[PDB]
Design an enzyme around this catalytic site. Structure first.
Site, PDB file in Angstrom:
ATOM      1  N   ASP A 153      -2.293 -35.108  23.811  1.00 12.79           N
ATOM      2  CA  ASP A 153      -3.449 -35.505  24.621  1.00 12.79           C
ATOM      3  C   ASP A 153      -4.695 -35.730  23.781  1.00 12.79           C
ATOM      4  O   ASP A 153      -5.776 -35.295  24.148  1.00 12.79           O
ATOM      5  CB  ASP A 153      -3.745 -34.478  25.712  1.00 12.79           C
ATOM      6  CG  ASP A 153      -4.586 -35.046  26.832  1.00 12.79           C
ATOM      7  OD1 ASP A 153      -4.798 -36.275  26.848  1.00 12.79           O
ATOM      8  OD2 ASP A 153      -5.035 -34.267  27.695  1.00 12.79           O
ATOM      9  N   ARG A 157     -12.207 -37.213  25.380  1.00  6.49           N
ATOM     10  CA  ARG A 157     -12.512 -36.159  26.324  1.00  6.49           C
ATOM     11  C   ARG A 157     -12.137 -34.821  25.741  1.00  6.49           C
ATOM     12  O   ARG A 157     -12.699 -33.802  26.114  1.00  6.49           O
ATOM     13  CB  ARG A 157     -11.748 -36.388  27.618  1.00  6.49           C
ATOM     14  CG  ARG A 157     -10.248 -36.523  27.453  1.00  6.49           C
ATOM     15  CD  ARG A 157      -9.604 -36.867  28.782  1.00  6.49           C
ATOM     16  NE  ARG A 157      -8.171 -37.093  28.648  1.00  6.49           N
ATOM     17  CZ  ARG A 157      -7.629 -38.268  28.356  1.00  6.49           C
ATOM     18  NH1 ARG A 157      -8.401 -39.325  28.163  1.00  6.49           N
ATOM     19  NH2 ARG A 157      -6.316 -38.386  28.253  1.00  6.49           N
ATOM     20  N   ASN A 158     -11.187 -34.818  24.820  1.00 11.24           N
ATOM     21  CA  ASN A 158     -10.709 -33.568  24.252  1.00 11.24           C
ATOM     22  C   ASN A 158     -11.207 -33.355  22.839  1.00 11.24           C
ATOM     23  O   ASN A 158     -10.713 -32.485  22.135  1.00 11.24           O
ATOM     24  CB  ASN A 158      -9.182 -33.515  24.309  1.00 11.24           C
ATOM     25  CG  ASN A 158      -8.654 -33.497  25.727  1.00 11.24           C
ATOM     26  OD1 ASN A 158      -9.333 -33.056  26.650  1.00 11.24           O
ATOM     27  ND2 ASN A 158      -7.430 -33.970  25.906  1.00 11.24           N
ATOM     28  N   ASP A 171      -7.974 -28.685  24.387  1.00 10.80           N
ATOM     29  CA  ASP A 171      -6.989 -29.018  25.421  1.00 10.80           C
ATOM     30  C   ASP A 171      -5.557 -29.113  24.966  1.00 10.80           C
ATOM     31  O   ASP A 171      -5.027 -30.200  24.790  1.00 10.80           O
ATOM     32  CB  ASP A 171      -7.376 -30.297  26.168  1.00 10.80           C
ATOM     33  CG  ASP A 171      -6.701 -30.408  27.515  1.00 10.80           C
ATOM     34  OD1 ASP A 171      -5.784 -29.610  27.792  1.00 10.80           O
ATOM     35  OD2 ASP A 171      -7.092 -31.291  28.304  1.00 10.80           O
TER      36      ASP A 171
HETATM   37  C1  LIG Z   1      -8.785 -27.655  27.806  1.00 11.11           C
HETATM   38  C2  LIG Z   1      -9.622 -28.690  28.227  1.00 11.11           C
HETATM   39  C3  LIG Z   1     -10.974 -28.649  27.941  1.00 11.11           C
HETATM   40  C4  LIG Z   1     -11.507 -27.553  27.200  1.00 11.11           C
HETATM   41  N1  LIG Z   1     -12.837 -27.525  26.921  1.00 11.11           N
HETATM   42  C5  LIG Z   1     -13.391 -26.537  26.239  1.00 11.11           C
HETATM   43  C6  LIG Z   1     -12.619 -25.473  25.788  1.00 11.11           C
HETATM   44  C7  LIG Z   1     -11.256 -25.461  26.053  1.00 11.11           C
HETATM   45  C8  LIG Z   1     -10.696 -26.546  26.787  1.00 11.11           C
HETATM   46  C9  LIG Z   1      -9.305 -26.587  27.087  1.00 11.11           C
HETATM   47  N2  LIG Z   1     -14.686 -26.560  26.002  1.00 11.11           N
HETATM   48  C10 LIG Z   1     -15.327 -25.877  25.067  1.00 11.11           C
HETATM   49  N3  LIG Z   1     -16.622 -26.138  25.123  1.00 11.11           N
HETATM   50  C11 LIG Z   1     -16.809 -27.015  26.142  1.00 11.11           C
HETATM   51  C12 LIG Z   1     -17.975 -27.638  26.662  1.00 11.11           C
HETATM   52  C13 LIG Z   1     -17.873 -28.515  27.735  1.00 11.11           C
HETATM   53  C14 LIG Z   1     -16.628 -28.784  28.301  1.00 11.11           C
HETATM   54  C15 LIG Z   1     -15.496 -28.174  27.794  1.00 11.11           C
HETATM   55  C16 LIG Z   1     -15.594 -27.282  26.701  1.00 11.11           C
HETATM   56  O1  LIG Z   1     -16.510 -29.657  29.381  1.00 11.11           O
HETATM   57  C17 LIG Z   1     -17.467 -30.669  29.404  1.00 11.11           C
HETATM   58  C18 LIG Z   1     -16.755 -32.014  29.446  1.00 11.11           C
HETATM   59  C19 LIG Z   1     -15.464 -31.990  30.248  1.00 11.11           C
HETATM   60  N4  LIG Z   1     -14.475 -32.830  29.596  1.00 11.11           N
HETATM   61  C20 LIG Z   1     -13.312 -32.064  29.173  1.00 11.11           C
HETATM   62  C21 LIG Z   1     -12.941 -31.019  30.215  1.00 11.11           C
HETATM   63  C22 LIG Z   1     -11.754 -30.168  29.761  1.00 11.11           C
HETATM   64  N5  LIG Z   1     -11.828 -29.733  28.379  1.00 11.11           N
HETATM   65  C23 LIG Z   1     -12.394 -30.601  27.367  1.00 11.11           C
HETATM   66  C24 LIG Z   1     -13.598 -31.404  27.837  1.00 11.11           C
END
Ligand SMILES: c1cc2c3nc(ccc3c1)-n1cnc3ccc(cc31)OCCCNC1CCN2CC1
Length: 294
Positions: A153, A157-158, A171
């Protein structure tokens, strides 16, 4: 060679060194969701000595076959080890209740949003920055391949941005050691033949580069995933050069999108190429940070 076997990280025990009291974790807003589950913001008390009250991210299953997948995600993360461009696992809540995976919180968030908010600046955000992100992601992917890990993945976004503009890949969950899926980032072999390798991730890296040099653009803009989409990609359709991309970087993307997986560039190989595209002073500074981190 019965004496020589493959150590499956899924069959290895969980070190309780990672256990965190659920009463020490305060959960907050939903940062977002990936293929499965959700990531929420949280505050942790007693996890770090330097930071008694630390902001963190928590991966958890939604109220809605996934529980063990989460556990597997935890397992792979436990054995991956530390890396500057890989988000860090801080701990987990696995006993007497839903599984919570505690991970580092990154201040600047995902690249997609960052690239978007700093779009107009691109005339803060600079071309060198884009190349730096490209280089770091390549390094982290190299680390994962070294650990025999296929993320499955890789996308903007990740890819997260931490303080110091250091990128972090996140992720796992679709990650495997050698369901809705991210098709526009997936390689033809993976979609049509369910084959996933490091080389399949290389294709995703190319799609990622297009995202970066399109400054947050959605892959295959306007195209809906359907019979025609698959036929085209099978026939060899590839996206065109992004607007803010050099010929050199587009070439990288093109290589990454070879129909023959074995002819696509390796993350090791990819790293060197990008290095050349940046000041040689960069490598040294990167290495310094990559030694301090540890
Ligand atoms: C799976 C998917 C993730 C994760 N994220 C993390 C940490 C572990 C994750 C695991 N993590 C860390 N510090 C963040 C700050 C903002 C954030 C996620 C953050 O979400 C904002 C944007 C959303 N877009 C994706 C949502 C799922 N996400 C990756 C980003």
């Amino acid at each position: 060679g019965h004496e020589y076997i493959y150590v499956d990280p899924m069959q290895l025990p969980y070190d309780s060194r990672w256990e965190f009291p659920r009463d020490g974790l305060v959960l907050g807003r939903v940062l977002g969701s990936g293929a499965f589950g959700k990531v929420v913001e949280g505050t942790a008390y007693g996890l770090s000595r330097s930071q008694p009250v630390m902001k963190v991210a928590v991966k958890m299953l939604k109220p809605t076959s996934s529980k063990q997948a989460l556990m597997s995600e935890l397992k792979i993360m436990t054995h991956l080890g530390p890396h500057l461009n890989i988000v860090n696992l801080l701990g987990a809540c696995t006993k007497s209740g839903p599984i919570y995976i505690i991970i580092e919180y990154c201040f600047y968030g995902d690249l997609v949003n960052y690239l978007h908010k700093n779009r107009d600046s691109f005339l803060g955000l600079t071309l060198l920055d884009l190349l730096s992100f490209t280089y770091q992601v390549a390094r982290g992917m190299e680390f994962l391949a070294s650990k025999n890990c296929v993320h499955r993945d890789l996308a903007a976004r990740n890819v997260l941005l931490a303080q110091g503009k250091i990128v972090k890949i996140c992720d796992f969950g679709l990650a495997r050691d050698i369901t809705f899926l991210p098709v526009k980032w997936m390689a033809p072999e993976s979609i049509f033949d369910n084959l996933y390798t490091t080389l399949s991730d290389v294709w995703s890296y190319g799609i990622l580069l297009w995202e970066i040099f399109s400054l947050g653009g959605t892959p295959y803009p306007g195209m809906m995933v359907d019979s025609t989409f698959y036929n085209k990609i099978k026939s060899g359709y590839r996206m065109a050069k992004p607007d803010h991309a050099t010929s050199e970087v587009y070439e990288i993307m093109v290589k990454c999108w070879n129909s023959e997986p074995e002819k696509r560039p390796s993350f090791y190989h990819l790293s060197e190429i990008v290095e050349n595209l940046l000041p040689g002073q960069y490598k040294k500074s990167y290495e310094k940070i990559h030694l301090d981190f540890l």
